[PDB]
Amino acid sequence: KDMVEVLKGVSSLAISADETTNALVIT
Amino acid sequence: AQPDVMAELEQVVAKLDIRRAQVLVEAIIVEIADGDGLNLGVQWANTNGGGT
Fold first, then answer.
1. Closest residue by Cα to residue B11 from B21, B22, B1
2. Count of H helices and E strands in chain A?
3. Under an 8 A CB cutoff, do B20 and A18 touch?
4. Distance between CA A22 and CA A5 in Å, rounded?
5. Which of chain B's residues have a Cβ under 8 Å away from the Cβ of A27?
6. Residue A17 to residues A4, A5, A6, B32, B38, Cα–Cα distance (Å)
7. Exposure of B27 in the CB half-sphere (CA atoms within 13 A)
8. Distances from the Cα of B5 to the Cαs of A15, B37, B45, in angstroms?
9. Can you tell me the distance from the alpha carbon of A18 to that of B5, in angstroms, rounded to the nearest whole number?
10. Distance of residue B2 Cα from the nearest chain A Cα, in angstroms
11. How far is B1 from chain A (nearest CA, A)?
12. Which domain of life is it from (chain B)?
């Protein structure tokens, strides 16, 4: 969840983080 | 979605639906407390001379 925000800058490319498996889904 | 995205979403889902592992967390809080007060004191009172 925290990494999504970090990576959003780099993209800003489409990101979400799954709170459950704590995984990052980027495209 | 398009069949190309369907196959892409199908891998995303399979990775994202991985059996999340469980954690047993034991905490151990140990505290120990004590201490020693001491009150000793001597008073002398004399009718003729005086008192403390």
1. B1
2. 1, 2
3. no
4. 14
5. 8
6. 6, 10, 12, 44, 62
7. 2
8. 16, 77, 101
9. 19
10. 15
11. 15
12. Bacteria
Instruction: Say which amino acid occupies A22.
Output: N
Q: Give the count of beta carbons closer than 10 Å to the beta carbon of residue A10.
A: 9
Closest approach of A14 to chain B, Cα-based (Å): 13
Measured between beta carbons, the chain A residues lying within 8 angstroms of B15 are: 23
- In a mutational test of the A interface, the residue from B8, B9, B15, B16 whose CB has the highest number of chain A CBs within 10 Å is B16
Method used experimentally: cryo-EM
The minimal CB distance from A20 to the residues B12, B15, B20 is found for B20
